[PDB]
């Protein structure tokens, strides 16, 4: 039935990104990416900040995007071996993590004369992902709240230009994109 | 860290239209630079030169942005 | 050392002397009518000073951006 | 004799370098030194193939004055290319260190930023004397004497206003000097 409430409240705000996120005439791919994908970080941060504290241990007791998909936590050399955590451990982790990626003055450079490193688009690919498990969950688990908060249109505006954005440089696969193919079909038009 | 929802929704409202300003402004400086440049000039290298220096610079500030230098 | 060509750099002087004074007056601007607003609205003397405070801090963050680098 | 040009759409300039109000000195002393930093770099690139280590087999600032290099560590006879590029690349470090020239918002100046700031303008200048001795008449030929000019009027300009330069370093020029600022 989520699907019919999310295909209900599509539409959204009081303008075209579509134009916005395509990569300026003779800008850098790499830095374009990063400013973005920061961009992004901040506003699902403090989006699932608004929702806090209705995603609790009891009320997600496991890492949900709807009862079709599950995620568990990894990918990480330190704590390595899955886990099967709930919404907010799962986010916190995540988020957490993310946080220390883009801090890396390595990976995201502050300084104006260094380089990106050469496996830049791959972590990238990684963070938006995983930035997109975060709003799949919040989409499917913690919805009433945005409604009852009327945060819906600032929602679905944040997760157009996040979608368009991937979308434009195919940044996360279709695999991943599942729990809200049936929205992103939607929004994009 | 939990945020209030009107904060939020603020910050959206305000993005959102810091985002389309800036591209629209981004487009502005772009066509500007070149309105002027071809009005009374120039050789090809010339413009080569001055596209390559604004889009360096351009590059920066988003990078700035990026770096939250801005606090 | 790189080398620039000559149309480059007149065309970069001629511009930028333009935009010197332009931003002078318009900061003088911002200065003055910011007084003359806030002496209007009748305000406290406190109150006045954090306006210029805020005022001068969004300048010289604007100028210090610009320094490195900003378009 | 031989008039001095000056552009022209507009010239202030004085007014142009005057510290706003309540605005912080080392905050306007840094942007306009970073200002200049550029104009001259890209002035000294278009006449940089006549600037050759042949051509100039020194650091001239006219027959009285000779540069040479030392500090980014014994002065060093070098030529005019090869000081320049020291130079250049010497204040280059200085503006990208974040400690010296700060790019966040918070970040305070340092102390002994005046000093740096003026041995840097100090140094520019020199270049300024070079192309106007040694290299001048390419910058007539290539038309940019109007530009040349305009630039070193707004540097001493902004100099004096400050007096980030000693007299005695500007010897070299005073003779035009006191023609532009009048
Ligand atoms: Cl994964
Ligand atoms: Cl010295
Ligand atoms: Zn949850
Ligand atoms: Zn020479």
């Given amino acids: 039935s989520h699907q019919y409430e999310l295909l209900k409240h599509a ?11 395509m990569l300026p005439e003779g800008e850098d791919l ?20 608004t929702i806090t ?3 609790t241990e009891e009320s997600c007791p496991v890492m949900s995007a709807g009862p079709k998909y599950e995620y568990h936590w990894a990918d990480g050399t330190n704590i390595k ?17 993310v946080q220390d990626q883009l801090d890396d003055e390595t990976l995201f450079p502050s300084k104006i004369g260094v380089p990106f490193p ?34 819906e249109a600032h929602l679905n505006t944040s ?19 599942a729990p809200l193919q049936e929205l992103i079909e939607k929004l994009t038009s | ?9 603020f910050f959206m409202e305000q993005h959102v239209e810091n985002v389309l300003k800036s591209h629209q402004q981004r487009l502005h400086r772009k066509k500007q630079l070149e309105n002027e ?32 230098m801005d606090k």
């Fill in chain 1, 81 to 97: 071996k899955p886990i099967k955590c709930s919404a907010p451990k799962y986010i916190d982790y995540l988020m957490t993590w």
């Fill in chain 1, 159 to 177: 997760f157009k230009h996040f979608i368009f954005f991937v979308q434009e440089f195919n940044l996360i696969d279709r695999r991943e994109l």
């Fill in chain 2, 37 to 68: 440049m071809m009005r009374v000039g120039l050789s090809q290298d010339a413009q080569d030169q001055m596209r390559k220096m604004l889009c360096q610079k351009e590059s920066n500030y988003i990078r700035l942005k990026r770096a939250k």
């Fill in chain 1, 11 to 21: 539409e959204a705000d009081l303008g075209n990104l579509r134009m916005a996120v």
């Fill in chain 1, 118 to 151: 050469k496996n830049f688009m791959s972590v990238a690919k990684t963070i938006l992902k995983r930035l997109f498990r975060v709003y799949a969950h919040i989409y499917h688990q913690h919805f009433d709240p945005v409604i009852q908060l009327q945060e």
């Fill in chain 1, 30 to 49: 790499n830095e374009w990416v990063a400013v973005n994908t920061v961009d992004f970080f901040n506003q699902i941060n403090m989006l699932y900040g």
């Fill in chain 1, 53 to 55: 504290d209705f995603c």
């Fill in chain 2, 1 to 9: 860290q939990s945020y209030s929802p009107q904060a939020f929704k």
